[PDB]
Design a protein around this ligand. Structure first.
Ligand SMILES: NC(=O)c1ccc[n+]([C@@H]2O[C@H](COP(=O)([O-])OP(=O)(O)OC[C@H]3O[C@@H](n4cnc5c(N)ncnc54)[C@H](O)[C@@H]3O)[C@@H](O)[C@H]2O)c1
Ligand SMILES: NC(=O)c1ccc[n+]([C@@H]2O[C@H](COP(=O)([O-])OP(=O)(O)OC[C@H]3O[C@@H](n4cnc5c(N)ncnc54)[C@H](O)[C@@H]3O)[C@@H](O)[C@H]2O)c1
Ligand SMILES: NC(=O)c1ccc[n+]([C@@H]2O[C@H](COP(=O)([O-])OP(=O)(O)OC[C@H]3O[C@@H](n4cnc5c(N)ncnc54)[C@H](O)[C@@H]3O)[C@@H](O)[C@H]2O)c1
Ligand SMILES: [Zn+2]
Ligand SMILES: [Zn+2]
Lengths: 445, 523, 50, 100, 50
């Protein structure tokens, strides 16, 4: 049952490989019975799975992991409710082509520590939708929340008609046990989510890998924006699970025409503008040894200031530092994974996009940018911003945490919790990963 | 030796060199369509060629005119690749999308006919006679059957020649055990119209036994699953009304359950109140007449009329509150301000005031059928099911603290909705305080909330409402031992998702503690 | 080479080698099936993939 | 602009005759007054601007339907009785006739 | 004695409304099993892509 070293790891994959090859011959009708019943009991346990992931890691709000486990179980079910992935997809009689879908096989699942239980619901639902199996290798900080989250989906699928051991997981991870899983000869895909040191390792084993990277989110608030909307949406998305989500607003770029009104709208609300000694007192607590320290990742805004050496009020939510330089020397131009911002000032709209082009240079090359303007009266600025920014998704008037993931505020992005960045960031998707990436379409000509 | 043996040997020949590259098959592709599909299902390659030379047919645009022409033929993850196609210019693109903000589609869904006046019970019952209905089932309370209220329907129905049957065995709270009893009576009688005579729980028990008579294999554990958004939920309700219509005659003047898609039923195994919400539970006809409301006692008139104040007050500040349900939410508060003191004291000697309160409860039911309630009804369903406090008394104690809870300029964890611009629940609470005329012509926003809170503090004073849950008959040794369980149960009672704030569990137990000790909630 | 192309840390689009098993059942056109194998296998002396 | 002014002033007369009618009950008095509140604040804004103030073109398009809730159940008065004859005799468009 | 005429409040079964809810509401009439539809338009709305 348990897996701790490499001798019983190969007994786990050989159990999964035997039970996957009889799941690969299922029909379309008896997979939608399994895919519905797995999502039906994954949204039923959104409350206890959210309390385990804060008891294990201690880096999030328990009330925000409820609607993140709910997004990963009923929005992933709703978009891919009736999508052909098992039998004959299309057929042409005038040209004589039949397009048949397949599975891929065993998939190496690498979950992060920021979203330890929501990606375990998401990667399990899209795996048994396309009639293939998955092996999980959780982060060592939050290993018990991920293995419990994959167990609820597994035991609900077996009661619906799945094979006996379809979803396996490493019970006690290691830097050697996970590397022995990725170099296994009879796995076929690596679904790997994490930082830039992991994407280089996921594409280093000889296997097709679907990796995603990290990323900043430069925000451009020009002079014709809604100031009451742009401030209240940054505060909602950056405080969403204390900013542990990918594509959270790490830095805003405001033009000089409305730079003072945005600062006053931030100051009267839950933002706290750092001034003088407090600005330098927090820049040496974020970068520990040239990297982001794991002591502020996901902590509230009053514990970051307590770790810095002063005290903000207990109900403040965003630490704002007004910086000037766009470089690797400034620690506020990096990915923080914490409710901390960085306000830049620009003299024009076309200068604000220029500073935003240098802010997708340090952390995350093609992940996500954002822009706040009136999207009806200014159609020339929404096309100039889409042509200049080299990201994968361009959000307009949208909170980046709820808008980076799909099916919220747009109803046309594919809902997923693994956001691709393309070959800019060293990936091969440039999209949101769904069940259409694990198909291996086969044509009959 | 056979065709099905030839595919078996071909499956072992794609095993040694190249796992998913290319196979081929020669047969007549018109007379044998069953062999070209069995060969396509068995062979695990990327392209299946039929009657084609594999060198000219493996590359595209020869012999097929539909394969993409390329000289680099993929094999997929069988052979350790990531394409499973012919490589073209569409694999070297890195598509970039620009997503603009859109708003969630709202609605305004009501019953097909809402008949209402002073005595329009038999004039509305003549419509279901002329529709060809011949077998009717009437779900009543035990009090309404012993006092001739159920005989006002059976006398009109049986005089026209239909077969009636009365189920009068519901309680104050409609547990699941007395629902399957009525559903067993339903499919043994096979009616065509279900008349839900009653004010609250007789109507909620009739909506669920309408489900288990229409589709008798549905599970209650899937109806009570909390969604994040309707039209995107997991368990779709089946299409009802295929063999039984629903008529909704109301008697109490507090609950607009005749127009709302709600049915609050108790699980009866763990003791939990579950608000079941989907728009297939909307009745086909709502009959709101004030002849059944005149002989209502004073304890039921005060519990009901203050419940309908909280119905129109939470449906006006909610995030689903559009311009369609803001007029009905304010009209139901104008009538409940002028006539609810008159309908309690004067009672049945002032019929024109007892009629307007019975109409104002249904007008508030138009408001929260389309823009759901907030966090006050989420705690009132748990507070009422734990200590047996009647619904109407529970949310009356709670409403003075939820108003102080929601009216914040910068609240912690405001909710996520595309229509909701910013936290603006304090402005909409001030739009109530001058629509009712409670404010002087010169006031700030923070002063109008005080005059609104002072209005329904005196309204609960002259209606016989206690000041605290402790004065309502709740022991401190029992309340403080369950104040942590009820604070987590109220977090996921499906009315939480429409509040202007997204409440923390630590904040939901602060409202419950300050309401027991009679204090006012201060952040 | 596919094992080496996916071993450097970079997104790679690799293709492999492959056999081509041919099934000629009893209802085939024998004059077509033989004359098409001879055309495609002698095409550049069979150096083509598939 | 000619269709926006003819329509928006027609929906004012829809909610104004459905509020004073004899069939006007308490169910259609809130919708008759809500459709006049939105047509007071946004109909000058939706005419001058147009598509340069979409949030005002949307509220007028909703306020015409909210007035349609009012006079579906409490019918119009004598102004629409003369406007149907004045519009069919001299080819005056509906919306211009009952506005005069 | 005097009685009052029975009034009513009759509406369509579904009144869908927002900024762009034309194709999201048209997906409801697809899932209801409707297979043949007739569309009555004006002459201007047919020549302008409406
Ligand atoms: N692209 C997205 O949608 C997305 C979503 C969430 C997070 N992220 C990124 O991931 C980060 C979350 O924090 P994190 O701690 O998970 O980042 P991380 O890079 O530490 O990733 C942790 C996980 O990656 C694996 N891993 C790490 N180093 C490895 C190695 N050398 N070899 C093999 N596997 C290795 C581990 O198994 C672990 O579970 C964020 O910084 C963010 O940029 C991206
Ligand atoms: N449908 C909805 O959306 C909705 C909304 C709120 C509450 N509810 C549910 O309904 C219940 C509240 O119902 P309620 O209190 O309005 O009615 P009720 O069924 O609780 O009636 C209270 C008692 O008074 C008696 N009674 C009822 N009508 C009478 C009349 N005309 N004259 C004299 N006596 C009468 C009945 O015998 C009953 O036992 C709650 O428990 C709640 O769960 C439903
Ligand atoms: N389906 C297709 O797309 C397709 C088309 C033609 C050929 N092929 C395959 O190619 C073979 C034809 O012979 P070939 O000589 O081209 O194959 P090969 O594998 O010998 O390829 C040789 C070329 O690949 C590179 N290469 C080889 N080994 C390498 C390593 N370890 N690291 C880095 N680069 C390396 C070299 O630069 C060399 O030019 C056939 O067996 C066939 O399976 C496939
Ligand atoms: Zn209520
Ligand atoms: Zn008109």
């Amino acid at each position: 049952m348990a897996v701790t070293n490499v001798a019983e790891l190969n007994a786990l994959v050989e159990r999964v490989k035997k039970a996957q090859r009889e799941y690969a011959s299922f029909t379309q009708e008896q997979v939608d019975k399994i895919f519905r019943a797995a999502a039906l009991a994954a949204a039923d346990a959104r409350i206890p799975l959210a309390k385990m992931a804060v008891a294990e890691s201690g880096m999030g709000i328990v009330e925000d992991k409820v609607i993140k486990n709910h997004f990963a179980s009923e929005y992933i079910y709703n978009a891919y409710k009736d999508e052909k992935t098992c039998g004959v997809l299309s057929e042409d009689d005038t040209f004589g082509t039949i397009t048949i879908a397949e599975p891929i096989g065993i998939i190496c699942g690498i979950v992060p520590t920021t979203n330890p239980t929501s990606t375990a619901i998401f990667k399990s639902l899209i795996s048994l939708k396309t009639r293939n199996a998955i092996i999980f290798s959780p982060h060592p900080r939050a290993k018990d929340a991920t293995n419990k989250a994959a167990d609820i989906v597994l035991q609900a699928a077996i009661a619906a008609g799945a094979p006996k051991d379809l979803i396996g997981w490493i019970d006690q991870p290691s830097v050697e046990l996970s590397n022995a899983l990725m170099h296994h000869p009879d796995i076929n895909l690596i679904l790997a989510t994490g930082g830039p040191g992991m994407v280089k390792a996921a594409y280093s084993s000889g296997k097709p890998a679907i990796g995603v990277g990290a990323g900043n989110t430069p925000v451009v608030i020009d002079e014709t924006a809604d100031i009451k909307r742009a401030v209240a949406s940054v505060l909602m998305s950056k405080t969403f699970d204390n900013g542990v989500i990918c594509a959270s607003e790490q830095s805003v770029v405001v033009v000089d025409s409305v730079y003072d009104a945005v600062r006053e709208r931030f100051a009267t609300h839950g933002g706290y503008l750092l001034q003088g000694k407090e600005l330098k007192a927090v820049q040496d607590v974020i970068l520990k040894n040239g990297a982001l320290n794991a002591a502020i990742v996901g902590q509230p805004a009053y514990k970051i200031a307590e770790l810095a050496g002063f005290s903000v009020p207990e109900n403040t939510k965003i630490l704002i530092g007004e910086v000037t330089v766009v470089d690797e020397s400034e620690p506020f131009a990096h990915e923080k994974l914490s409710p901390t911002l960085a306000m830049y000032r620009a003299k024009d709209f076309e200068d604000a996009v220029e500073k935003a082009e240098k802010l997708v240079a340090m952390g995350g090359i093609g992940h996500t940018s954002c822009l706040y303007t009136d999207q009806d009266n200014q159609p020339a600025r929404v096309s100039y911003f889409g042509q200049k920014m080299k990201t994968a998704r361009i959000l307009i008037n949208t909170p980046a945490s709820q808008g980076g993931i799909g099916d919220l505020y747009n109803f046309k992005l594919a809902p997923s919790l693994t956001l691709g960045c393309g070959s800019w960031g060293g990936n091969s998707i440039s999209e949101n990963v769904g069940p259409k990436h694990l198909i291996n379409k086969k044509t009959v000509a | 030796k056979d065709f099905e043996d030839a595919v078996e040997k071909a499956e072992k020949l794609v095993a040694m060199g190249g796992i998913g590259h290319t196979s081929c098959l020669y047969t007549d592709q018109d007379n044998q369509p069953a062999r070209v599909s069995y060969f396509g299902q068995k062979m695990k390659t990327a392209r299946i060629l039929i009657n084609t030379p594999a060198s000219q047919g493996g590359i595209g645009d020869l012999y097929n005119f539909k394969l993409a022409p390329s000289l680099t033929l993929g094999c997929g993850s069988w052979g350790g690749n990531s394409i499973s196609e012919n490589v073209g210019p569409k694999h070297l693109i890195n598509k970039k999308t620009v997503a603009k903000r859109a708003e969630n589609m709202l609605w305004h869904k009501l019953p097909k006919s809402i008949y209402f006046r002073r005595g329009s019970l038999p004039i509305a019952l003549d419509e279901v006679i002329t529709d060809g209905h011949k077998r009717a089932l009437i779900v009543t309370d035990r009090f309404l059957f012993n006092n001739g209220y159920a005989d006002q329907i059976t006398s009109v129905l049986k005089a026209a020649g239909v077969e009636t049957e009365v189920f009068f065995e519901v309680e104050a709270d409609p547990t699941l055990s007395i629902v399957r009893k009525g559903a067993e009576l339903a499919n043994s009688f096979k009616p065509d119209v279900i008349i839900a005579l009653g004010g609250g729980s007789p109507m909620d028990a009739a909506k669920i036994m309408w489900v288990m008579y229409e589709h008798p294999e549905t599970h209650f554990e899937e109806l009570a699953l909390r969604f994040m958004d309707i039209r995107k939920r997991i368990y779709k309700f089946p299409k009802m009304g295929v063999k039984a219509k629903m008529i909704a005659v109301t008697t109490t003047s507090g609950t607009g359950s005749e127009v709302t898609p709600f049915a609050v039923v108790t699980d009866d195994a763990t003791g939990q109140k579950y608000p079941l919400a989907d728009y297939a539970l909307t009745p086909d006809m709502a009959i709101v007449d004030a002849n059944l409301v005149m002989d209502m006692p004073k304890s039921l008139c005060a519990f009901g009329g203050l419940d309908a104040v909280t119905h129109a007050m939470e449906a006006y500040v909610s995030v689903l509150a559009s311009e369609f349900s803001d007029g009905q939410a304010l009209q139901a508060l104008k009538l409940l301000k002028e006539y609810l003191p008159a309908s309690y004291h004067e009672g049945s000697k002032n019929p024109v005031a007892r009629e307007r309160v019975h109409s104002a409860a249904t007008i508030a039911g138009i408001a929260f059928a389309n823009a759901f309630l907030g966090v006050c009804h989420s705690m009132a369903h748990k507070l009422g099911s734990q200590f047996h406090i009647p619904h109407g008394l529970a949310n009356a104690l709670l409403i003075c603290n939820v108003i102080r809870y929601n009216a914040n300029d910068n609240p912690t964890k405001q909710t996520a909705f595309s229509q909701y611009d910013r936290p603006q629940a304090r402005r909409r609470y001030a739009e109530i305080a001058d629509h009712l005329g409670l404010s002087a012509p010169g006031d700030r926003t923070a002063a109008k909330i005080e005059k609104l809170l002072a209005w329904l503090e005196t309204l609960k004073a002259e209606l016989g409402i206690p000041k605290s849950i402790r004065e309502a008959g709740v022991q401190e040794a029992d309340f403080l031992a369950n104040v942590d369980k009820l604070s987590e149960d109220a977090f996921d009672d499906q009315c939480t998702g429409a509040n202007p704030r997204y409440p923390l569990i630590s904040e939901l137990k602060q409202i419950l503690l300050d309401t027991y000790y009679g204090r006012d909630y201060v952040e």
